[PDB]
Amino acid sequence: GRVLIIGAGGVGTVVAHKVAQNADVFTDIMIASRTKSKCDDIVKAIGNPNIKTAQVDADNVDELVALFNDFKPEMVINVALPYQDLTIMEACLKAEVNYLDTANYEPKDEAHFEYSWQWAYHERFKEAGLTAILGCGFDPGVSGIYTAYAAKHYFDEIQYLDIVDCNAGNNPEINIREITQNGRYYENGQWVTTGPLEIHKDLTYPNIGPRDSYLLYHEELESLVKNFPTIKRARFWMTFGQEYLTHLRVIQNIGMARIDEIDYNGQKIVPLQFLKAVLEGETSIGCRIRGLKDGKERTYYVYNNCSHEEAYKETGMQGVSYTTGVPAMIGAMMFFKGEWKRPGVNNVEEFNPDPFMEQLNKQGLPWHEVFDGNLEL
Amino acid sequence: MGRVLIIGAGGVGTVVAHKVAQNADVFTDIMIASRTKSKCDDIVKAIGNPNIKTAQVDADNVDELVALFNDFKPEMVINVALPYQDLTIMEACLKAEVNYLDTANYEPKDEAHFEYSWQWAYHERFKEAGLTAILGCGFDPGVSGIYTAYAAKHYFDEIQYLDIVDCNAGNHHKAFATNFNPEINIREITQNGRYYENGQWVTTGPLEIHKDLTYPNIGPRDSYLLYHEELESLVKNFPTIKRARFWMTFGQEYLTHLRVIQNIGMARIDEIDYNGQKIVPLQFLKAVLPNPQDLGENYEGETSIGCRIRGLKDGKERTYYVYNNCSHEEAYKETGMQGVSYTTGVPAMIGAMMFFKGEWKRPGVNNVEEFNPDPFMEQLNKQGLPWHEVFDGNLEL
Numbered sequence: 112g113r114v115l116i117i118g119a120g121g122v123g124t125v126v127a128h129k130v131a132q133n134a135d136v137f138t139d140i141m142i143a144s145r146t147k148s149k150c151d152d153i154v155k156a157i158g159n160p161n162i163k164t165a166q167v168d169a170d171n172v173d174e175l176v177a178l179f180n181d182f183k184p185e186m187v188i189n190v191a192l193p194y195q196d197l198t199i200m201e202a203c204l205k206a207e208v209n210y211l212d213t214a215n216y217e218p219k220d221e222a223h224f225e226y227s228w229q230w231a232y233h234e235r236f237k238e239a240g241l242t243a244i245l246g247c248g249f250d251p252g253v254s255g256i257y258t259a260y261a262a263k264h265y266f267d268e269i270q271y272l273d274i275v276d277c278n279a280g281n282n283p284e285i286n287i288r289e290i291t292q293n294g295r296y297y298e299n300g301q302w303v304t305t306g307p308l309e310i311h312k313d314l315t316y317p318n319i320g321p322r323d324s325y326l327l328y329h330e331e332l333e334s335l336v337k338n339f340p341t342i343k344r345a346r347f348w349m350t351f352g353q354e355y356l357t358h359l360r361v362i363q364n365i366g367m368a369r370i371d372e373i374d375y376n377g378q379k380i381v382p383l384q385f386l387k388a389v390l391e392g393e394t395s396i397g398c399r400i401r402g403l404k405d406g407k408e409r410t411y412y413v414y415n416n417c418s419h420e421e422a423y424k425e426t427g428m429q430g431v432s433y434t435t436g437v438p439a440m441i442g443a444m445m446f447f448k449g450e451w452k453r454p455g456v457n458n459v460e461e462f463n464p465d466p467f468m469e470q471l472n473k474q475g476l477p478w479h480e481v482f483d484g485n486l487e488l
Numbered sequence: 489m490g491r492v493l494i495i496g497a498g499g500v501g502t503v504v505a506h507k508v509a510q511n512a513d514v515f516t517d518i519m520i521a522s523r524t525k526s527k528c529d530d531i532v533k534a535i536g537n538p539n540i541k542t543a544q545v546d547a548d549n550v551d552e553l554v555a556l557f558n559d560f561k562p563e564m565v566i567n568v569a570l571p572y573q574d575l576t577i578m579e580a581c582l583k584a585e586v587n588y589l590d591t592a593n594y595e596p597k598d599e600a601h602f603e604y605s606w607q608w609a610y611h612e613r614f615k616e617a618g619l620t621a622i623l624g625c626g627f628d629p630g631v632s633g634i635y636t637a638y639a640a641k642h643y644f645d646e647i648q649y650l651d652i653v654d655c656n657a658g659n660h661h662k663a664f665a666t667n668f669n670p671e672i673n674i675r676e677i678t679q680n681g682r683y684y685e686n687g688q689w690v691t692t693g694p695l696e697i698h699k700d701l702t703y704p705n706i707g708p709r710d711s712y713l714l715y716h717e718e719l720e721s722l723v724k725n726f727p728t729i730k731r732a733r734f735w736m737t738f739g740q741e742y743l744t745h746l747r748v749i750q751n752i753g754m755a756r757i758d759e760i761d762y763n764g765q766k767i768v769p770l771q772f773l774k775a776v777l778p779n780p781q782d783l784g785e786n787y788e789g790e791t792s793i794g795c796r797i798r799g800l801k802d803g804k805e806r807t808y809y810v811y812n813n814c815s816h817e818e819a820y821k822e823t824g825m826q827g828v829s830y831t832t833g834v835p836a837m838i839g840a841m842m843f844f845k846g847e848w849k850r851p852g853v854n855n856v857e858e859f860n861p862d863p864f865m866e867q868l869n870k871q872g873l874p875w876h877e878v879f880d881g882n883l884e885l
């Protein structure tokens with residue numbers, strides 16, 4: 112049960128905490144990242160001196176292979192940035208290490224992500240007997256596990272999938288890249304494109320109430336549509352307050368959302384990253400699913416609500432880092448326990464959702480089901 | 489001597505170079521020196537006069553400036569670099585016995601507070617050396633004080649109320665851009681408002697007080713009260729003034745962008761460590777924002793800047809409104825810049841002309857209202873900034 116965490120950010124902080132909380136499964140833990148001091152901060156916060164740390168540039172396959180051959184992990188949990196997905200997978204192949212991440216690949220010079228890059232590794236991973244688990248955060252991640260759970264127990268055919276993500280509380284480089292692209296959803300065999308944050312409507316969230324929700328593309332639509340060909344329409348919605356949208360608009364207008372490197376006193380700075388250097392309540396994230404069971408239409412809503420305060424008291428991080436870090440740990444737990452072992456490259460919906468859902472209820476993300484309700488869309 | 493040296497090759501310096509080159513009878517030898525020499529050479533190529541010399545200089549370095557001054561031997565140095573360079577350039581002018589003019593008074597790099605004490609401190613040294621320093625000779629500061637001196641000289645026994653009003657009614661068709669150096673521009677407009685009334689200076693919140701004011705050829709515009717450096721010297725030099733305020737128009741989209749820039753920390757003036765390098769966020773913002781110097785091509789509309797003055801003549805209250813409207817497109821066609829660079833650059837050239845012609849000769853450190861306004865006002869009509877007068881109208885203020 113040797114696990115290596117790459118990335119000492121908000122998510123990695125949560126993953127480390129949750130891995131440490133399950134030492135019967137995770138007997139040996141290391142945290143490696145670009146800035147080692149953040150790794151050591153996490154170890155001190157957890158209070159477990161047995162967690163090892165290391166500096167590594169995960170853009171460098173050779174550095175990674177040396178680290179992997181030193182610590183000898185059985186799985187690496189990549190919660191660095193999407194840019195590191197492929198170099199880490201390369202190192203995993205060469206050092207015969209299994210793999211898990213929470214976000215699929217996008218190149219540094221283009222804010223477009225898709226699964227082709229990582230799916231390309233399927234046969235190499237398979238012939239090496241290695242398992243890769245892609246997109247095992249909350250969304251992507253629990254959102255596809257929720258959908259697999261519904262398909263397994265409640266639906267003959269899933270026909271409409273609507274993922275809803277509300278942060279009702281009170282990494283910006285990858286975050287602002289995600290939300291500024293054209294919207295995109297799936298309907299009747301085709302991918303449909305909107306303007307950025309053009310389509311929106313009020314959706315009512317448990318314990319929160321109605322919130323302005325905006326349609327945008329999201330990674331998991333690509334694989335969920337592929338893996339559930341009964342789907343007639345799949346969309347993803349996220350809430351955005353007016354002040355947030357205003358700040359987002361201005362940031363773009365002034366040039367601080369740029370993703371190319373600019374030259375500033377002999378140093379290569381990308382405006383969006385420099386912005387990062389300067390930049391109560393709860394989340395509610397789930398899936399609203401409609402389809403057929405025993406010849407009749409049926410609706411289903413399954414969700415988690417995560418309190419920012421409770422997440423902070425446990426891990427020092429807020430609800431967005433918490434909801435992503437917990438499932439990443441559980442994915443590794445499923446592999447270590449043999450519940451999720453499938454040589455090749457896998458999306459979460461391809462595994463048995465039941466043992467994962469059972470752990471979510473025990474590891475800080477209890478989920479709730481509403482049957483036969485009005486899904487509002 | 490007739491030799492003039494221009495420091496700063498930005499938007500204002502581009503205009504100043506064009507305007508001095510247009511008056512070769514006065515300015516017989518011209519040099520443009522600036523931190524980045526290629527921009528000096530860009531200006532000379534645009535003007536088409538190979539006789540204009542260029543040079544690289546770091547105007548933060550008194551030694552470098554003195555060497556440049558003793559080589560070129562200017563009679564006056566027109567400082568249109570940043571306020572930060574005001575004192576080092578004045579130091580060098582004193583050491584090399586060269587006269588001085590700028591369009592903005594000093595603020596330290598580490599504090600967004602400007603005032604005249606720094607430069608007034610050089611008065612007796614300049615005076616003893618026979619050197620004249622002309623401070624704040626742009627449009628506002630500059631023409632705004634020359635307008636005031638003009639009104640005091642010709643139309644009032646006693647001026648009592650001064651309101652300077654500044655509207656940029658143009659459209660540069662950018663989501664957001666500033667009209668001059670964004671670093672200096674943003675530092676200025678984000679401070680607390682201040683004005684003068686009944687013997688005291690009153691502080692307001694930033695952009696707290698605003699009125700609808702009607703601008704010639706433009707109409708009503710949302711106008712905001714803020715401090716402006718010429719209020720300090722004009723209140724000093726015209727004691728009869730009872731109330732002095734400065735107003736500038738801001739559109740809603742502009743204010744929205746300005747608010748967000750401050751909230752996200754990109755208006756900060758302190759240095760942060762970014763990959764072992766010291767970076768001032770406001771200075772980084774300048775790098776990505778549109779360059780004011782490149783806006784003229786798609787700039788339409790015009791500016792309107794003037795002074796609304798009220799006071800007594802022969803015991804009766806009178807009003808006076810004097811202003812200039814400047815077409816962004818005409819400024820662009822003439823100089824490649826836009827109306828804010830133009831309104832600032834033309835009066836800087838004229839102040840130097842007044843010195844070269846002997847009209848404005850006053851050893852020491854001077855604000856523009858201390859000179860005879862008449863010959864300056866005459867040149868404004870001839871050098872591209874004609875002004876208009878309205879007598880006894882409603883000042884709305």
Ligand SMILES: NC(=O)c1ccc[n+]([C@@H]2O[C@H](COP(=O)([O-])OP(=O)(O)OC[C@H]3O[C@@H](n4cnc5c(N)ncnc54)[C@H](OP(=O)(O)O)[C@@H]3O)[C@@H](O)[C@H]2O)c1
Binds near residue numbers: 434
């Ligand atoms: N599926 C979901 O629900 C979900 C939700 C949110 C986020 N995520 C994903 O989670 C990941 C982490 O997010 P976060 O918020 O924790 O980000 P973060 O706070 O910026 O942390 C990223 C970490 O990766 C490190 N890193 C970056 N480049 C590296 C390199 N070349 N070599 C080694 N380490 C490197 C960073 O090092 P430094 O300390 O030097 O900066 C930092 O410690 C991202 O991929 C994000 O897309 C997924």
Ligand SMILES: NC(=O)c1ccc[n+]([C@@H]2O[C@H](COP(=O)([O-])OP(=O)(O)OC[C@H]3O[C@@H](n4cnc5c(N)ncnc54)[C@H](OP(=O)(O)O)[C@@H]3O)[C@@H](O)[C@H]2O)c1
Binds near residue numbers: 521523545
């Ligand atoms: N009175 C008024 O009505 C009024 C109105 C607007 C502006 N102004 C003033 O006019 C001045 C010029 O503004 P602008 O918009 O033209 O600014 P700008 O476009 O940024 O140009 C300033 C110039 O100074 C140069 N410079 C900066 N630091 C220097 C240093 N250490 N040594 C030498 N040169 C240096 C810059 O060089 P680089 O090319 O290397 O950047 C640039 O060429 C400012 O002081 C501003 O406050 C006055």
